[PDB]
Design a protein around this ligand. Structure first.
Ligand SMILES: Oc1ccccc1Cl
Ligand SMILES: Oc1ccccc1Cl
Ligand SMILES: [Cl-]
Ligand SMILES: [Cl-]
Lengths: 298, 288
């Protein structure tokens, strides 16, 4: 049957790497910082039983192209990469699942391009308008976002994050997990391989510099963000060291469509690694649910 | 004898201070985003018994404000205070420091024990505890979000000062344990000091010079002599800016009588929240 394959495609001016397995509805899985496609290792084979799973490396990461310059990492361009990818895969629509930055991009792609997104899944990613509105008024979110401010400085964060074989990034991950020994030494080797790709760390930090700089966080302008019009599932690990529960209060207000949120009270930011089977189960059930209900109790 | 203003040349700069009282010299040193006025509740009461001197530190209020991040390095700040003691015609002082004033007081004391009779610290980490422990404390890194914010040029000054310092006012107000601790009058006086030409950038330069990420995440050992003079630490436990991680286990840092008084219901601005009890503890420590 279908085994995992690596592939490469031109999208929106760049060459993007992805892995894919399975046949059927296109299901994109989009990672965040400081991950790459491999973050989805527990979900790919299980979802490939039902779906055509595609897990790309985003702009800047791992095997994907890394344009120079902060302006090349603005949210608008990242979402246009994903629209480009759906087309380059020979499709018009996708179910889109996004974690962390992958989720911020997914919220954005869905709001501005609802025609490309059949259903939306978000894991532990604040709605961008909630972040931009609420952060400056939330001491707990400002505290949790200490590293967003750190990342704004040029040159020096890349140096600090990469010293002693990326000890800093390893520690960021390790201190974020609810369970000990979640990553093996072997997993850490694989992550260092990706982090070490020339230009990867600078490009990753450029997402923060382009979209979460202090002028934006403390802006007096309100952000324009259309309501979400496609069925949405949010999966949320509650012990998230990066996102305050302040930012998810009344999240459903952003959605004018069927909306479900599944809380995982004992899991953290990396919910897909902490309860990988229950995450997979919830995503599958959501996608396979019929949108037409004309045979109650048959 | 009432509170009087003075100005004195020290270490290349002119420093403004207020003073009241006669006898043993007692220095009160403010931190960010304060000035001498933060000591308003303690100065008259302590002046009954001591020669109280409360300066504006380098960069602040009516004190000189040299240009350039390098001019705010800790060694220069402590040398300003050594210079002040001498300019006041003394050879030593009792030194009380809050926040940056406390970081400076730890530094002055460690390197110049001859200039310090006794040391009082209010809600200020030992600089070497900060430099050693912060990188290993998620709670301290989180509480220091604003230290990272302040590293970037120009933009923090803009944000902090917009809408008549609404941002800075909010930083203070969110830090206090009680509502309406500052009167409208107090806020006018704070705004007046924040508005002094160059004050805000010079204040932020302390963080850029001393708490930049190269320092915080350095793996080098910091060389800091043990404190050799009697020390009292006063600590408001509801401090939004400092984790209890940084103040425990001072034994390695202090080779002299040391005591710590915890204020479980007070925050970072302990001298404003419990002004009488703070003053009482200071007075008893110096006299007894
Ligand atoms: O580090 C990213 C962006 C800041 C919000 C937390 C995650 Cl999604
Ligand atoms: O804002 C200052 C310096 C960083 C530690 C907290 C206070 Cl003393
Ligand atoms: Cl392959
Ligand atoms: Cl759970």
């Amino acid at each position: 049957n279908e085994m995992l394959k690596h592939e490469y495609v031109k999208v929106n001016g760049i060459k993007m790497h992805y892995v894919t397995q399975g046949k059927g509805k296109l299901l994109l899985l989009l990672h965040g910082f400081p991950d790459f496609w491999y973050v989805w290792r527990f979900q790919i084979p299980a979802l490939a039983k039902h779906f055509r799973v595609v897990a790309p490396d985003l702009r800047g990461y791992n095997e994907t192209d890394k344009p120079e310059g902060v302006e090349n990492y603005r949210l608008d361009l990242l979402a246009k990469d994903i629209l480009g990818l759906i087309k380059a895969l020979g499709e018009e629509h996708a179910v889109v699942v996004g974690h962390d930055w992958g989720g911020i991009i997914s919220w954005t792609l869905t709001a501005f391009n609802p025609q490309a997104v059949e259903k939306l899944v978000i894991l532990n990613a604040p709605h961008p308008k909630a972040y931009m509105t609420r952060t400056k008024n939330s001491l707990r979110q400002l505290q949790k976002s200490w590293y967003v401010f750190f990342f704004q400085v040029a040159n020096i964060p890349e140096k600090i994050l990469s010293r002693n074989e990326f000890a800093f990034l390893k520690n960021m991950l390790i201190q974020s997990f609810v369970r000990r020994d979640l990553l093996t030494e072997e997993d850490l080797r694989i992550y260092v391989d990706a982090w070490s790709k020339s230009g990867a760390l600078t490009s990753a930090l450029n997402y923060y510099r382009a979209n979460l700089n202090p002028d934006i966080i403390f802006s007096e302008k309100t952000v324009v963000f259309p309501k979400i019009k496609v069925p949405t599932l949010v999966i949320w690990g509650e012990k998230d060291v990066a996102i305050s529960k302040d930012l998810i209060v009344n999240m459903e207000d952003f959605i004018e469509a069927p909306y479900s949120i599944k809380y995982f009270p004992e899991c953290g930011h990396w919910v897909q690694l902490e309860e990988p089977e229950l995450v997979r189960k919830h995503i599958e059930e959501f996608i396979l649910k019929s949108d037409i209900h004309h045979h109650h109790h048959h």
